[PDB]
């Protein structure tokens, strides 16, 4: 069949802040740079036939590693650019948990029926991200990897499972995460979630 | 935090000749062994309190390897025993799709829906399965393992999701593949499924 090996961005600088960051735009840190090389091992042997990434420099440099180390062609689609938190972005997570936690816990349990105050529209998100999956359905090649965002990848794979994006933050993956998504024509399978072997050398 | 690690048995010899399972219980093989023997890396730093497992012998032989070497208990529970496939099982499975295409794929959509003839009850597979849920978030201990079946640790995923046993064969674990599910008084977090880094070496 065909597999589409989801891959979260490396971690970058709000990150490791442990800040909100949405359109904001933060470099790799040099932990990023190195998990990035790291990713490199999970695919020497089973070389994907394309990566796909969002623009946002996060996910570029993490998949441009990648094709760079391997040859592999680079793809670039704003369809997958992490969802907009409007006036949420640049603000410390934990922080505004503190001042504000029902309404941070509503919208982990549901973003759909409590989305936060200024966030992109969900249904604006769920469509772009639908027909980058529509899209992913049709492409020719039978092994490819897309560099993504937490919002974005965990709403795909709500999708492709059928669940609804009230479950995307059901689900976690760390930075360089892989969660391997396989289709066969009709349907999806979910053979792995937020796979982070290759980091286990920074333990 | 309560972690939940789910771990699918080691490789039994009905897995490793492609036979439908189910209540029978057939051994583990010499690689199932092994398997057992690596999954106790993975629980280094974070050591599980008690091992539960369901009691057929592929799991419990599984469990107790790890049980074993590090040094706590292990408990047997009869309500994460596999679902029960009833004529079906002992059935070499491709054979059985090449014959019956519509009844496997339909059964795999929707295994509610569409149950295998003779399959046990899905509101009885359901019910015990539950209970056994609400017996995990009232334990005490802040971390535990449960070993068991592909049918029974899918189903506990989809319960504590939320999304419901159509989706129990949407999500794959291989043999001693672990999914760390959070429990925070209130509601679940998937971290990870069918994490296997601990059969890299066997690579």
Request: with cysteine; aromatic share 10%; hydrophobic share 40%.
């Given at each position: 069949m065909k597999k589409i090996y989801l891959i979260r961005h490396a971690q970058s600088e709000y990150n490791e802040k442990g800040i909100f960051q949405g359109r904001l735009d933060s470099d790799?840190?040099?932990?990023?740079?190195?998990?990035?090389?790291?990713?490199?091992?999970?695919?020497?042997?089973?070389?994907?036939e394309v990566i796909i990434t969002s623009p946002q420099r996060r996910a570029y440099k993490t998949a441009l590693t990648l094709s760079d180390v391997?040859?592999?062609?680079?793809?670039?689609?704003?369809?997958?650019?992490?969802?907009?938190?409007?006036?949420?972005?640049?603000?410390?997570?934990?922080?505004?948990?503190?001042?504000?936690?029902?309404?941070?816990?509503?919208?982990?349990?549901?973003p759909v029926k409590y989305p936060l105050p200024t966030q992109e529209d969900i249904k604006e998100f769920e469509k772009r991200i639908k027909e980058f999956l529509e899209d992913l359905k049709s492409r020719k090649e039978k092994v490819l990897a897309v560099?993504?965002?937490?919002?974005?990848?965990?709403?795909?794979?709500?999708?492709?499972?059928?669940?609804?994006?009230?479950?995307?933050?059901?689900?976690?993956?760390?930075?360089?995460?892989?969660?391997?998504?396989?289709?066969?024509?009709?349907?999806?399978?979910l053979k792995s979630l937020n796979d982070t072997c290759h980091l286990l050398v920074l333990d």
């Open positions: 790799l840190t040099p932990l990023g740079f190195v998990q990035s090389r790291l990713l490199v091992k999970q695919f020497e042997r089973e070389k994907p391997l040859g592999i062609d680079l793809i670039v689609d704003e369809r997958i650019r992490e969802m907009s938190f409007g006036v949420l972005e640049g603000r410390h997570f934990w922080t505004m948990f503190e001042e504000n936690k029902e309404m941070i816990i509503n919208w982990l349990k549901d560099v993504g965002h937490g919002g974005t990848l965990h709403g795909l794979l709500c999708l492709a499972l059928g669940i609804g994006l009230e479950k995307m933050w059901h689900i976690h993956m760390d930075n360089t995460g892989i969660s391997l998504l396989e289709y066969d024509g009709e349907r999806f399978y």
